[PDB]
Amino acid sequence: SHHHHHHLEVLSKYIIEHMEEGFSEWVILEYSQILREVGAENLILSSLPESTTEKDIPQRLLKLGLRWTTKDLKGINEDFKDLELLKDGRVCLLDPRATIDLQPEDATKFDYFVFGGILGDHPPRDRTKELKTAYPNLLISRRLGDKQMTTDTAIRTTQLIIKDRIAFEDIKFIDYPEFRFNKNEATEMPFRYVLDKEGKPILPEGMLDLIK
Numbered sequence: 001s002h003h004h005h006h007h008l009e010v011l012s013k014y015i016i017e018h019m020e021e022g023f024s025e026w027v028i029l030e031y032s033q034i035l036r037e038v039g040a041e042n043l044i045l046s047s048l049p050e051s052t053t054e055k056d057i058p059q060r061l062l063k064l065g066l067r068w069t070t071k072d073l074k075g076i077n078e079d080f081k082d083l084e085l086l087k088d089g090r091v092c093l094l095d096p097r098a099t100i101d102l103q104p105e106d107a108t109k110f111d112y113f114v115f116g117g118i119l120g121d122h123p124p125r126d127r128t129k130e131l132k133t134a135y136p137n138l139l140i141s142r143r144l145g146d147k148q149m150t151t152d153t154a155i156r157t158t159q160l161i162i163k164d165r166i167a168f169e170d171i172k173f174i175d176y177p178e179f180r181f182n183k184n185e186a187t188e189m190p191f192r193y194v195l196d197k198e199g200k201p202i203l204p205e206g207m208l209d210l211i212k
């Protein structure tokens with residue numbers, strides 16, 4: 001049969017450079033949330049190890065239609081005909097150490113938004129800089145405020161700024177929220193989270209259950 005080889009993909013893009021070994025439960029929950037929020041057609045998981053095959057991708061992510069590749073930023077265009085050439089200046093790296101905060105007018109300046117697929121540590125190990133130094137002529141950096149976010153929070157904030165055109169200063173965050181389940185067990189999450197319409201921090205589905 002010849003009809004299922006169709007390049008239907010042709011009919012803002014988010015790129016996560018996977019920088020973890022394998023897929024921990026937390027990574028799977030975060031990536032799942034990202035897929036649900038930006039859509040499988042608008043997300044690329046890149047830079048997976050060269051030995052990566054479909055059996056190495058978690059079934060929770062494949063079920064959501066994850067588009068993934070072992071190519072890095074410079075090779076992605078070979079793999080997806082639908083991805084506009086990643087070109088110098090039009091690719092934004094979201095970087096906690098950028099000088100300039102992302103603003104809605106940056107929607108006119110960039111076509112691709114790149115994030116480290118990193119489970120951040122505290123203190124940060126500044127691994128996102130690796131990305132900036134790996135592609136010195138491709139990427140232009142933008143910040144999302146002065147506090148570390150998880151990958152799914154950073155993508156959610158970027159979508160609020162770029163698609164919904166909301167200024168960074170207008171986004172309601174909660175910094176380092178505590179989740180207490182009894183008078184003796186509590187967990188403070190050392191990241192900045194977006195607040196939902198109900199005043200609660202937005203976490204990936206199942207994250208709360210995992211923390212407890």
Ligand SMILES: Nc1ncnc2c1ncn2[C@@H]1O[C@H](CSCC[C@H](N)C(=O)O)[C@@H](O)[C@H]1O
Nearest residue numbers: 094095096115116120121125126127144149
């Ligand atoms: N304040 C901020 N500004 C811009 N991007 C951010 C951000 N906080 C998180 N991100 C995005 O979310 C990703 C995961 S968090 C950063 C990992 C941390 N630097 C460490 O090495 O431990 C980053 O790679 C970045 O792309």
